[PDB]
Each structure stands twice: as C-alpha cells, then as structure tokens.
Design a protein around this ligand. Structure first.
Ligand SMILES: Nc1nc2c(ncn2[C@@H]2O[C@H](COP(=O)(O)OP(=O)(O)O)[C@@H](O)[C@H]2O)c(=O)[nH]1
Ligand SMILES: [Ca+2]
Ligand code: NA
Length: 166
C-alpha cells in the first residue's frame, strides 16, 4: 500500500497529540508527555483504498530547530491545528504555513486547517474566520474534538485526499 507521512503542527496545548492518539489508539488523553520518538503507524481504508498512516507529532519540539525541520522534510502532508478557544493559536497559523513552505521549498504543499477543541464552551474563533483563512490558502478546514471524536477521522482522511490530488 501507499504510506502517508502526515505531520501535525500548531501552537502549544492546541491538541496535536490528543488528536494523534485519538486517531491511532481511539482514546482521549487528559495529558501527553512528548518524546523525540512519537510517530504512530496505522492501516486505514480511505475511499476504498487501503493505506498506511504514519503520524508525526511535533509536540515539544522547539519553535525553530533542526529536528523540527527534519520532521517536516519527511512529511508529505500537514495538519495545521489551532484551538477554537484560543485566538492566539489561530493567529499563529500563518507562521506554521510559512515554515512548511520553507522546508518543503514549495507553495503547493498538501495541508489542512484544523480547528480543535470544538467541544469546549468558550469559543473565540468562528468557523467563518477559519474558513476564510483556509480559503486564502486554498486548503480545506475541518472542525475537530479529540475528546468527543467529532471530525478526527475527517481531518486526517481529508489530508490524505489532499496528498492524493497532488
Ligand atoms: N476538551 C478538549 N480538550 C482537549 C482537546 N484536545 C486536547 N485537549 C487537551 O488539551 C491539552 C493539551 O493537549 P495536547 O494534545 O498535549 O496538545 P499539544 O501540546 O498541542 O500536543 C491536554 O490536556 C488535552 O487533554 C479537545 O478536543 N477537547
Ligand atoms: Ca481513532
Ligand atoms: Na502541551
């Protein structure tokens, strides 16, 4: 089968790791201690075609480092995650897109905008705002909760579809 290396980026505490664990292990974690070793592999079927997802979680890597750059050289598609209750994480998204464009040395990198923690009450970012930013990038936007599992499969599977159209 094809193997898809998907890299999850975003500000601290937005839920990169819980999203990854929810996808792979079908559990929601209340806390996650990152390592240098957190890649996760899982076989899934997307649109009738079996494939392998290799999820690389960037949690805990420094904002600018050789390891983070190596991680995104290896990635074929990217999830840019913010949290819908943290406006600053949504404002940081352009920084992660600029970083991916730099490392991949391209303006057309498979990417999906992910608005996580959609179960929480104190929303500060509208779906319309996020859709408008995704639209400016020409990429899909998906709303998720690693806790209720809403949108989790959709976000990773849509990213695979994005790779499959490149
Ligand atoms: N309610 C809620 N909490 C979440 C969600 N995603 C992550 N969290 C919590 O947010 C905190 C940070 O999550 P983590 O995955 O470690 O974020 P990361 O640093 O970006 O990898 C943890 O306490 C998680 O339990 C979500 O969708 N909903
Ligand atoms: Ca799962
Ligand atoms: Na954290």
């Amino acid at each position: 089968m094809t193997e898809y290396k998907l890299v999850v980026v975003g500000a601290g505490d937005v839920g990169k790791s819980a999203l990854t664990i929810q996808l792979i292990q079908n559990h929601f974690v209340d806390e996650y201690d990152p390592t240098i070793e957190d890649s996760y592999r899982k076989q899934v079927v997307i649109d009738g075609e079996t494939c392998l997802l290799d999820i690389l979680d960037t949690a805990g890597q420094e904002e600018y480092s050789a390891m983070r750059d190596q991680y995104m050289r290896t990635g074929e598609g990217f999830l840019c995650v913010f949290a819908i209750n943290n406006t600053k994480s949504f404002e940081d998204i352009h920084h992660y897109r600029e970083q991916i464009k730099r490392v991949k040395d391209s303006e057309d990198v498979p990417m999906v905008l992910v608005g996580n923690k959609c179960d929480l009450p104190s929303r500060t970012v509208d779906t319309k705002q996020a859709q408008d930013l995704a639209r400016s990038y020409g990429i899909p936007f998906i709303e998720t909760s690693a806790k209720t599992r809403q949108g989790v499969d959709d976000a990773f599977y849509t990213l695979v579809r994005e790779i499959r159209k490149h």
